[PDB]
Amino acid sequence: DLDLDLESSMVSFFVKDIKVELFVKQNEIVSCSILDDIHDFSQNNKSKWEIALLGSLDDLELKLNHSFA
Amino acid sequence: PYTWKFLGISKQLSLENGIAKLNQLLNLEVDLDIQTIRVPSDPDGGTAADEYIRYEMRLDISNLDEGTYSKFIFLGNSKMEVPMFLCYCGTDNRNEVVLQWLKAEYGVIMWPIKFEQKTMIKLADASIVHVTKENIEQITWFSSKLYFEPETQDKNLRQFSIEIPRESCEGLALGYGNTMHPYNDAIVPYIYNETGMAVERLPLTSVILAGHTKIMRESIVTSTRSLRNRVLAVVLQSIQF
Amino acid sequence: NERLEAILSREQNLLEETRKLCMNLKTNNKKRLTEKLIQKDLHPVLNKAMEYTYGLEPDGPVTFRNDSHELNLMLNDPIKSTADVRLDKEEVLSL
Amino acid sequence: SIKPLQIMDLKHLTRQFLNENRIILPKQTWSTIQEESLNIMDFLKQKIGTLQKQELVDSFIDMGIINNVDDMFELAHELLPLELQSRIESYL
Amino acid sequence: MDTEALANYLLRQLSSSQEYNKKLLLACGFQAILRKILLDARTRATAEGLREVYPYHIEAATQAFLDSQ
Amino acid sequence: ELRLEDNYVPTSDTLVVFKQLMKLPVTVLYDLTLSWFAKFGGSFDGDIYLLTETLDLLIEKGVRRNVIVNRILYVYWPDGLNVFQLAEIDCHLMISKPEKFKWLPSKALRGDGKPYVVKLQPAKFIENLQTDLAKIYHCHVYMFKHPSLPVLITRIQLFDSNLDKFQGKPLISRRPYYVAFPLNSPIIFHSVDKDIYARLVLQSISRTISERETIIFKPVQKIPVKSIHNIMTLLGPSRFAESMGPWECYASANFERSPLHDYKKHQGLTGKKVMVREFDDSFLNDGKEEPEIRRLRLEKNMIKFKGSANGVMSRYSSLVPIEKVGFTLKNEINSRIITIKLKFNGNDIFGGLHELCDKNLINIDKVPGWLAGENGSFSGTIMNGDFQREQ
Amino acid sequence: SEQLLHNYVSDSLLTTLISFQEFKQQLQSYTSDEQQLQHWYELLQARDARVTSELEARIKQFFITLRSRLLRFLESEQLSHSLSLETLIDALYKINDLLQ
Amino acid sequence: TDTYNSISNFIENELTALLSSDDYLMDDLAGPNEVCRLLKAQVIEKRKDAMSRGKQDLLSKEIYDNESELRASQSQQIMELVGDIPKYSLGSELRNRVEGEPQSTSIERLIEDVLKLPQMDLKVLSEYSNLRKDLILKCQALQIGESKLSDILSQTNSINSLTT
DNA sequence: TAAGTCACATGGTGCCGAGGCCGCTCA
DNA sequence: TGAGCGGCCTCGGCACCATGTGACTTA
């Protein structure tokens, strides 16, 4: 379950339980934030995921389905 | 701030006789003044039977405020259906004694005067035309303010006012042309053309001339100590049948 | 009271610095217009840009801002650098 | 608190005196006289602690308010209802 | 709030019929003090010309009154 | 350290809190009690499930709200309510009674002059605002989202310092300052207050929103309007903004359908029923007119003042009631600027004007756009036929 | 600054406030011997000079401790409003890794 | 901090109570009894309006005014002497990276901030300048690579269109 | 001496938060 | 029968323009 604002720019959603919230400009993600912290989850891998998740929206969908498996 | 209450009179009563009875009853001499004014001096306002009789009864004791300066002004014309009205300022309790004596002595029927919307517009027209000692009429321009209190459901619109500055009023009058009734001929048609409001139909409670007078539906209050002849005449044509 | 005195002193120092920076920028822009590009070294094809920009103030950047939406245009955007540090092609090719 | 009076108590106490004799009190003056009522009560209790017959009228003569008992039950006339001033007259 | 209420205030400050009369006379004297002080306040305000009175006016008036008492 | 946490207890009058909780219904009191005891706890001893069962026994006992108010003010928290409680009850009063609050809009201009569409990271915004206002005053800020509207309403409460007054050790509260943040809109609604603390709160809010380029709040209106739903309809990020009065048909789009729709039901094929309007001056000249054309002129006034034939749905009530508007119409009659200042007052200006138009007191063929409710709740000067608002 | 403390101490010393003439004039009740009064005044001068020096020592220690503690507070405030270069270098290294 | 209570408490503990107790004890132990009582009487007599709490309060307020003047002086000295690059001269993402990340990692804001990075022992300054120049080269390579990748993507788009 | 400019001090209209009683009102 | 919300409404404090008169100057 996700929450959309009026222009669908400031969003937040859960992939499995990780709260990934995004600031997205015109058809391109310019900012990302991984919020939920698991004891197995680290911070450098979190930063690498945040850098990797940037880019286009179709690319975000493809890479998120890739990293989900 | 001298409020004038207006009362009509059913008969043409002559005040130069019998006023000694009022002097004896009130134990004081009143300063009755007799004048014969001719108000519609303009050719388009009538050229015959224009003469009025103006009585200025005054309970003169001292001159500090209206507590000792409750004036009485009477106007009359014998060539009308209703021949006389009075208007009195101040708040002295002797004024109703004067009215009771006037009734019980002359046998007149007296009723309060209420002004309609067009009557109030004509009174605002009358209260700017000033007569000069050189026998000329001068229109002194005042920044008017039409003030309405409509009654709508759920009290949706309690009140609304239309403020008209002085230079805009004279600009409207000069745009219409050389006329001697500026509000009824230039200001009110301009308001109707612009905002769509027919102010002769809307509930108009007062029109306020800044610094001179603010007439209401039942009273006229004036900064000036007296009331000019045009206002008295327009009130006299107001109560005709 | 002493803490708020320190806060006011810091804010007044910032205000004086900002006003000085604004006046310095205004005088520096005037001096840069007067001493750099209005001289004889100005390229003659920029003589018309100067005319509408400072000579009498249309056909300039308004025309391009109209055309970049009329034509959906891009150009080769400049490589953003600072402090006259020019781009090193060997460094970025090694990068 | 418990010993100081309230502002509305002073309105109800002296509102008619400021109305017959034209007095205009802003809120600062109201708070000032609310403060002053305590000082007046302390001064009155310091001057008169216990109450018996002769000492109160002697003190009120010393107060500069009155000159005799006639002034006492004339000042009580303008400050009390009719039953209370009649009772005071029976007391004096 | 009657004068008897101020007498109730005075008796609860100090805590039969003759003492009630004594306290009623005390309340009358208190009202006399307040009326005299307010009269002096208006006198000084009219001397300075102000329509209303102010705390410094009535403070000076009551200091002059307590100087004589 | 001067920031105020969510566990400090201030000195609040017990009777004011007593009459404050009287207005709330029983179910929000129930939800508040369980949430408060789950988060902070209370002086009452018991398990969270045990207290849930106790409140359950209270609600199938059908007890009045007065008894549970005395309970939560005398045994649950007898020492005093925490600041979070005092903020959350007042926010719940705002939710329950939105018509008792007036708001003032302010655009979030920035830099060159283009409006800044404000976006909030709520927890970080609250933390940054509290740290910014902690340097000046003892500040506690509480933020929540409206159950119905897409806003983010904050509540900023400021605390001051403190015959012999004995001892209180208090922190006296002031009236709280509310600033409402719509999701994506430059317009910012704030509570009606012009003292130095309101200016401080708005200034700190402008300094803590920005973080990239300096932002100033410019007030777009000086007349407050009630009922936060109405100010989102007027100034919020909705279609009804900049389409009001006779142009609400465009904001509601009830007149055209999709181009993918049935073309037998198109407006141009079925047609619409109208009347010939007389352009000659005949309104001032004139009884028991035909009830079909009377319905048509009523529909004409309804269309002029509300945009729709049936309206946005007694029947004179507009989409947003307006309290005060003042228009200054200026014309040029032969090189003379002629100004007319029309001021209005009431509970619904344009509904009352619609009622006056229905009573044949105002000509509906000559009532202008700005009088009809176009650019509603904005007061300004009409020069050259164009309405520019005041500042 | 410390001159005010020195004046406050010296203005309330028995020898500075009471002279030997006033000492003998007051103490005529018990002994009229001038030698014993002189010896007692010498003991008074010795003891009040000693405690004057000791009060001066403690007020100097108090002033230095107060100034040092409040100066460390000022230094901590200035460091809080300032930025060390090494943390900036570490942040730039992290940013360099991100850009890499 | 609380300097004023420390000053006032130090005065009222070590300055007046200690003085009174020490004077009483030393006058008692100087020998004798009547001598001490009498001398205490006149030294109390002439110290009137000098040991009162108003005098200690005024002394504490005056020494506080002197110390506050010294605070203004050393505050100007400590604010005019800066050691490194201060705040508000660098971007917000840099400032957030300095004191704990806010989880908002954005490439574009980082590029915009380190493009505005200021430039200046000697080895630390040289390392900072080298790192800043390296980051400027990183930004330049990033924009060049992005524009190049867009061009190659357009070429591959046309090639795949022809192939399909 | 008639008319004009001036600040000045009081008059007054509009506005609003606080709070009280009313006015049904419903269980 | 009894608690209870909502329009009313007035108190009064504030805000602002409006206003009449003495002091002073001009002719």
Curated annotation (Swiss-Prot), chain B:
Organism, by scientific name, is Saccharomyces cerevisiae (strain ATCC 204508 / S288c) (Baker's yeast)
Q: What is the lineage of its organism?
A: Eukaryota, Fungi, Dikarya, Ascomycota, Saccharomycotina
This chain belongs to the protein called Inner kinetochore subunit IML3
Quaternary structure and partners? Forms a heterodimer with IML3. CHL4-IML3 is part of a larger constitutive centromere-associated network (CCAN) (also known as central kinetochore CTF19 complex in yeast), which is composed of at least AME1, CHL4, CNN1, CTF3, CTF19, IML3, MCM16, MCM21, MCM22, MHF1, MHF2, MIF2, NKP1, NKP2, OKP1 and WIP1. Interacts with CHL4 and CTF19.
- Where would you find the membrane-spanning parts of this chain? none
Tell me, which GO biological process terms does this entry list? Answer: ascospore formation; attachment of spindle microtubules to kinetochore; cell division; establishment of meiotic sister chromatid cohesion; establishment of mitotic sister chromatid cohesion; maintenance of meiotic sister chromatid cohesion; meiotic sister chromatid segregation; protein localization to chromosome, centromeric region
Note from the entry: Present with 125 molecules/cell in log phase SD medium.
Sorted UniProt keywords = Cell cycle, Cell division, Centromere, Chromosome, Kinetochore, Meiosis, Mitosis, Nucleus
Q: What family does the Swiss-Prot or TrEMBL record give for this protein?
A: Belongs to the CENP-L/IML3 family.
Q: Where does this one sit in the cell?
A: Nucleus; Chromosome, Centromere, Kinetochore
GO cellular component annotations of the record: kinetochore; nucleus; outer kinetochore
Curated annotation (Swiss-Prot), chain F:
Tell me, what is an example of a GO biological process annotation in this record? mitotic spindle assembly checkpoint signaling
Q: Cell cycle among the record's keywords?
A: yes
- Identify the domain of life: Eukaryota
Q: Which GO terms describe its molecular function?
A: structural molecule activity
Where does it mainly reside?
A: nucleus
Q: Provide the alphabetized UniProt keywords.
A: Cell cycle, Cell division, Centromere, Chromosome, Kinetochore, Meiosis, Mitosis, Nucleus
**Record's GO cellular component terms:** kinetochore; nucleus; outer kinetochore
Q: State the compartments where it is located.
A: Nucleus; Chromosome, Centromere, Kinetochore
Output the Pfam families linked to this UniProt entry. Answer: CENP-N (PF05238)
Q: Subunit details for this protein? A: Forms a heterodimer with IML3. CHL4-IML3 is part of a larger constitutive centromere-associated network (CCAN) (also known as central kinetochore CTF19 complex in yeast), which is composed of at least AME1, CHL4, CNN1, CTF3, CTF19, IML3, MCM16, MCM21, MCM22, MHF1, MHF2, MIF2, NKP1, NKP2, OKP1 and WIP1. Interacts with CTF3 and CTF19.
Q: Which family does it belong to?
A: Belongs to the CENP-N/CHL4 family.
Any other noteworthy remark?
A: Present with 606 molecules/cell in log phase SD medium.
According to its UniProt entry, the function of this protein is described as: Component of the kinetochore, a multiprotein complex that assembles on centromeric DNA and attaches chromosomes to spindle microtubules, mediating chromosome segregation and sister chromatid segregation during meiosis and mitosis. Component of the inner kinetochore constitutive centromere-associated network (CCAN), which serves as a structural platform for outer kinetochore assembly.
Protein name as it appears in the record: Inner kinetochore subunit CHL4
Swiss-Prot record, chain G:
Q: Where in the cell is it found?
A: Nucleus; Chromosome, Centromere, Kinetochore
List the GO biological process terms.
attachment of spindle microtubules to kinetochore; cell division; chromosome segregation; meiotic cell cycle
Cellular component terms per the entry's GO annotation = kinetochore; Mis6-Sim4 complex; nucleus
Keyword annotations from UniProtKB, A to Z: Cell cycle, Cell division, Centromere, Chromosome, Coiled coil, Kinetochore, Meiosis, Mitosis, Nucleus
Family according to the record: Belongs to the NKP2 family.
How this chain assembles, per its entry, is: Component of the inner kinetochore constitutive centromere-associated network (CCAN) (also known as central kinetochore CTF19 complex in yeast), which is composed of at least AME1, CHL4, CNN1, CTF3, CTF19, IML3, MCM16, MCM21, MCM22, MHF1, MHF2, MIF2, NKP1, NKP2, OKP1 and WIP1. NKP1 interacts directly with OKP1 and AME1.
Q: What does this protein do?
A: Component of the kinetochore, a multiprotein complex that assembles on centromeric DNA and attaches chromosomes to spindle microtubules, mediating chromosome segregation and sister chromatid segregation during meiosis and mitosis. Component of the inner kinetochore constitutive centromere-associated network (CCAN), which serves as a structural platform for outer kinetochore assembly.
What's the protein here called? Inner kinetochore subunit NKP2
> What organism is this sequence from?
Saccharomyces cerevisiae (strain ATCC 204508 / S288c) (Baker's yeast)
Source lineage: Eukaryota, Fungi, Dikarya, Ascomycota, Saccharomycotina
Section of the entire sequence shown: 3 to 102 of 153
From Swiss-Prot, chain H:
**One annotated Gene Ontology cellular component of this protein:** kinetochore
Listed name of the protein: Inner kinetochore subunit NKP1
Taxonomy, superkingdom: Eukaryota
Q: Which GO terms describe its biological process?
A: attachment of spindle microtubules to kinetochore; cell division; meiotic cell cycle
Boundaries of the shown chain within the full protein: 2 to 179 of 238
Source species of the chain:
Saccharomyces cerevisiae (strain ATCC 204508 / S288c) (Baker's yeast)
State which gene encodes it: NKP1
UniProt-annotated location(s): Nucleus; Chromosome, Centromere, Kinetochore
Its job: Component of the kinetochore, a multiprotein complex that assembles on centromeric DNA and attaches chromosomes to spindle microtubules, mediating chromosome segregation and sister chromatid segregation during meiosis and mitosis. Component of the inner kinetochore constitutive centromere-associated network (CCAN), which serves as a structural platform for outer kinetochore assembly.
UniProt similarity note: Belongs to the NKP1 family.
Keyword annotations for this protein, in alphabetical order, are: Cell cycle, Cell division, Centromere, Chromosome, Kinetochore, Meiosis, Mitosis, Nucleus, Phosphoprotein
- What do we know about how this protein assembles, alone or with others? Component of the inner kinetochore constitutive centromere-associated network (CCAN) (also known as central kinetochore CTF19 complex in yeast), which is composed of at least AME1, CHL4, CNN1, CTF3, CTF19, IML3, MCM16, MCM21, MCM22, MHF1, MHF2, MIF2, NKP1, NKP2, OKP1 and WIP1. NKP1 interacts directly with OKP1 and AME1.
